[PDB]
Design an enzyme around this catalytic site. Sequence first.
Site, PDB file in Angstrom:
ATOM      1  N   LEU A  14      19.538 -18.620 -50.180  1.00  0.00           N
ATOM      2  CA  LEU A  14      20.438 -17.622 -50.754  1.00  0.00           C
ATOM      3  C   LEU A  14      20.833 -16.569 -49.744  1.00  0.00           C
ATOM      4  CD1 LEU A  14      18.798 -16.977 -54.228  1.00  0.00           C
ATOM      5  CD2 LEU A  14      20.768 -18.416 -53.694  1.00  0.00           C
ATOM      6  N   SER A  16      19.659 -14.547 -45.676  1.00  0.00           N
ATOM      7  CA  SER A  16      18.962 -14.659 -44.402  1.00  0.00           C
ATOM      8  C   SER A  16      19.195 -13.413 -43.570  1.00  0.00           C
ATOM      9  CB  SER A  16      19.445 -15.888 -43.638  1.00  0.00           C
ATOM     10  OG  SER A  16      18.357 -16.511 -42.978  1.00  0.00           O
ATOM     11  N   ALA A  18      16.845 -10.457 -40.581  1.00  0.00           N
ATOM     12  CA  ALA A  18      15.696 -10.233 -39.699  1.00  0.00           C
ATOM     13  C   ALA A  18      14.394 -10.264 -40.527  1.00  0.00           C
ATOM     14  CB  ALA A  18      15.837  -8.896 -38.981  1.00  0.00           C
ATOM     15  N   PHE A  19      14.443  -9.691 -41.755  1.00  0.00           N
ATOM     16  CA  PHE A  19      13.335  -9.626 -42.712  1.00  0.00           C
ATOM     17  C   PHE A  19      12.664 -10.984 -42.937  1.00  0.00           C
ATOM     18  CE2 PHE A  19      17.171 -10.456 -45.288  1.00  0.00           C
ATOM     19  CZ  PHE A  19      16.771 -11.449 -46.145  1.00  0.00           C
ATOM     20  N   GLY A  20      13.488 -12.025 -42.959  1.00  0.00           N
ATOM     21  CA  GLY A  20      13.087 -13.387 -43.248  1.00  0.00           C
ATOM     22  C   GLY A  20      14.189 -14.103 -43.997  1.00  0.00           C
ATOM     23  N   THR A  21      13.813 -14.992 -44.913  1.00  0.00           N
ATOM     24  CA  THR A  21      14.796 -15.773 -45.660  1.00  0.00           C
ATOM     25  C   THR A  21      14.517 -15.727 -47.145  1.00  0.00           C
ATOM     26  OG1 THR A  21      14.925 -17.235 -43.719  1.00  0.00           O
ATOM     27  CG2 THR A  21      15.921 -18.073 -45.730  1.00  0.00           C
ATOM     28  N   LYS A  41      10.862 -15.420 -51.215  1.00  0.00           N
ATOM     29  CA  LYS A  41      11.186 -14.686 -50.001  1.00  0.00           C
ATOM     30  C   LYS A  41      10.129 -14.962 -48.961  1.00  0.00           C
ATOM     31  CE  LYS A  41      11.966 -10.101 -49.782  1.00  0.00           C
ATOM     32  NZ  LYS A  41      13.042  -9.134 -50.112  1.00  0.00           N
ATOM     33  N   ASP A 136      12.755   2.296 -49.248  1.00  0.00           N
ATOM     34  CA  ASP A 136      13.931   1.537 -48.828  1.00  0.00           C
ATOM     35  C   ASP A 136      14.903   1.311 -49.969  1.00  0.00           C
ATOM     36  OD1 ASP A 136      15.660   0.301 -46.993  1.00  0.00           O
ATOM     37  OD2 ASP A 136      14.562  -1.641 -47.012  1.00  0.00           O
TER      38      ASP A 136
HETATM   39  C1  LIG Z   1      22.261  -8.717 -51.399  1.00  0.00           C
HETATM   40  C2  LIG Z   1      21.538  -8.249 -50.152  1.00  0.00           C
HETATM   41  C3  LIG Z   1      20.610  -9.313 -49.612  1.00  0.00           C
HETATM   42  O1  LIG Z   1      21.052 -10.249 -48.959  1.00  0.00           O
HETATM   43  N1  LIG Z   1      19.295  -9.193 -49.883  1.00  0.00           N
HETATM   44  C4  LIG Z   1      18.217 -10.113 -49.508  1.00  0.00           C
HETATM   45  C5  LIG Z   1      17.290  -9.326 -50.452  1.00  0.00           C
HETATM   46  N2  LIG Z   1      16.650 -10.055 -51.546  1.00  0.00           N
HETATM   47  C6  LIG Z   1      17.255 -10.727 -52.541  1.00  0.00           C
HETATM   48  C7  LIG Z   1      16.265 -11.247 -53.333  1.00  0.00           C
HETATM   49  C8  LIG Z   1      16.515 -12.046 -54.557  1.00  0.00           C
HETATM   50  C9  LIG Z   1      17.645 -12.851 -54.665  1.00  0.00           C
HETATM   51  C10 LIG Z   1      17.854 -13.547 -55.837  1.00  0.00           C
HETATM   52  N3  LIG Z   1      17.042 -13.477 -56.895  1.00  0.00           N
HETATM   53  C11 LIG Z   1      15.988 -12.664 -56.798  1.00  0.00           C
HETATM   54  C12 LIG Z   1      15.669 -11.957 -55.658  1.00  0.00           C
HETATM   55  C13 LIG Z   1      15.061 -10.808 -52.735  1.00  0.00           C
HETATM   56  C14 LIG Z   1      13.660 -11.029 -53.142  1.00  0.00           C
HETATM   57  C15 LIG Z   1      13.150 -12.310 -53.333  1.00  0.00           C
HETATM   58  C16 LIG Z   1      11.826 -12.486 -53.691  1.00  0.00           C
HETATM   59  C17 LIG Z   1      10.991 -11.391 -53.833  1.00  0.00           C
HETATM   60  C18 LIG Z   1      11.489 -10.107 -53.632  1.00  0.00           C
HETATM   61  N4  LIG Z   1      10.676  -8.957 -53.745  1.00  0.00           N
HETATM   62  C19 LIG Z   1       9.373  -8.918 -54.112  1.00  0.00           C
HETATM   63  O2  LIG Z   1       8.759  -9.923 -54.463  1.00  0.00           O
HETATM   64  C20 LIG Z   1       8.706  -7.594 -54.078  1.00  0.00           C
HETATM   65  C21 LIG Z   1       7.371  -7.309 -54.159  1.00  0.00           C
HETATM   66  N5  LIG Z   1       7.263  -5.952 -54.078  1.00  0.00           N
HETATM   67  C22 LIG Z   1       6.003  -5.173 -54.106  1.00  0.00           C
HETATM   68  C23 LIG Z   1       4.717  -5.885 -54.362  1.00  0.00           C
HETATM   69  C24 LIG Z   1       5.024  -5.356 -52.994  1.00  0.00           C
HETATM   70  C25 LIG Z   1       8.525  -5.476 -53.932  1.00  0.00           C
HETATM   71  N6  LIG Z   1       9.431  -6.431 -53.931  1.00  0.00           N
HETATM   72  C26 LIG Z   1      12.811  -9.934 -53.248  1.00  0.00           C
HETATM   73  N7  LIG Z   1      15.296 -10.055 -51.667  1.00  0.00           N
HETATM   74  C27 LIG Z   1      18.509  -8.502 -50.910  1.00  0.00           C
END
Ligand SMILES: *CCC(=O)N1CC(n2cc(-c3ccncc3)c(-c3cccc(NC(=O)c4cn(C5CC5)cn4)c3)n2)C1
Length: 271
Positions: A14, A16, A18-21, A41, A136
């Site tokens: 979905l 990608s 620097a954070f990861g994928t 993620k 953030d």
């Molecule tokens: C739109 C901008 C973009 O590209 N981003 C990447 C980032 N993003 C999107 C998702 C996501 C997409 C679709 N459906 C759901 C989420 C995520 C994402 C994926 C998996 C997990 C997370 N976050 C967590 O699991 C999490 C855990 N904590 C605290 C326990 C520590 C906080 N968050 C995010 N990321 C937006």
Amino acid sequence: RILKETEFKKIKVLGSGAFGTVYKGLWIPEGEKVKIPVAIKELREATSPKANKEILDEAYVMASVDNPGNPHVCRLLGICLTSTVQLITQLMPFGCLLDYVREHKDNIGSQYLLNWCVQIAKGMNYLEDRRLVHRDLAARNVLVKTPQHVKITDFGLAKLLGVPIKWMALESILHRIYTHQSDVWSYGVTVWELMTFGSKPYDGIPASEISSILEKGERLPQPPICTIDVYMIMRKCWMIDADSRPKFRELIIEFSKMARDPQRYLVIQGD
Ligand SMILES: *CCC(=O)N1CC(n2cc(-c3ccncc3)c(-c3cccc(NC(=O)c4cn(C5CC5)cn4)c3)n2)C1
């Protein structure tokens, strides 16, 4: 929940960075006959200077936020530790609110924009009640479950693995001070991004010059759709004195009052 690699599958990619994928996947919980659509993620490997047992213990303490929870804060369904950390949550099919506002620019009415502000302030107020500081908050970290239901993600993820200058409060840029009142500054920036339909804050201005511009009194411009009532709320989120900025409970109430008569506070060609 500790997940085994066999419990879940990564179907598409979905996002990608620097954070990861981020992957759009499927999850079959152990001992169940159901396949739950999730987002996985996979963070960048060897980012954290912590052991797997240390990360796992800290994520279990942090996931206590899922209890009792808030509808506007993402629930962490599971974690999987191998060479990388994999975070599993329910799939948010519309992506992030940053992309959503840029893609549906001429179709977003004042009623939607003000409701999103209310929902983000509700999720942030809840995080403040659990004493977890986000660090953030931005429109990219707000996910769209449905256009009428948004959720905050990636809270405390930076603290869990020991840099957005344009979303940071002056004290965070200068002294790396992260309180709930610096999350208020980031919230103001986030509201500005929704009001401008996804503009990048301080475009062209290098990050190195943000702290000096803030001290001169320069703030993000007043968006074309904002009446001065709405702009004054964001302008108050960007005060130098942290304790004078509004609280998430005040922002919920102010934006709820505005969502009751939306055409009075936001002027959109299309309402
Ligand atoms: C739109 C901008 C973009 O590209 N981003 C990447 C980032 N993003 C999107 C998702 C996501 C997409 C679709 N459906 C759901 C989420 C995520 C994402 C994926 C998996 C997990 C997370 N976050 C967590 O699991 C999490 C855990 N904590 C605290 C326990 C520590 C906080 N968050 C995010 N990321 C937006």
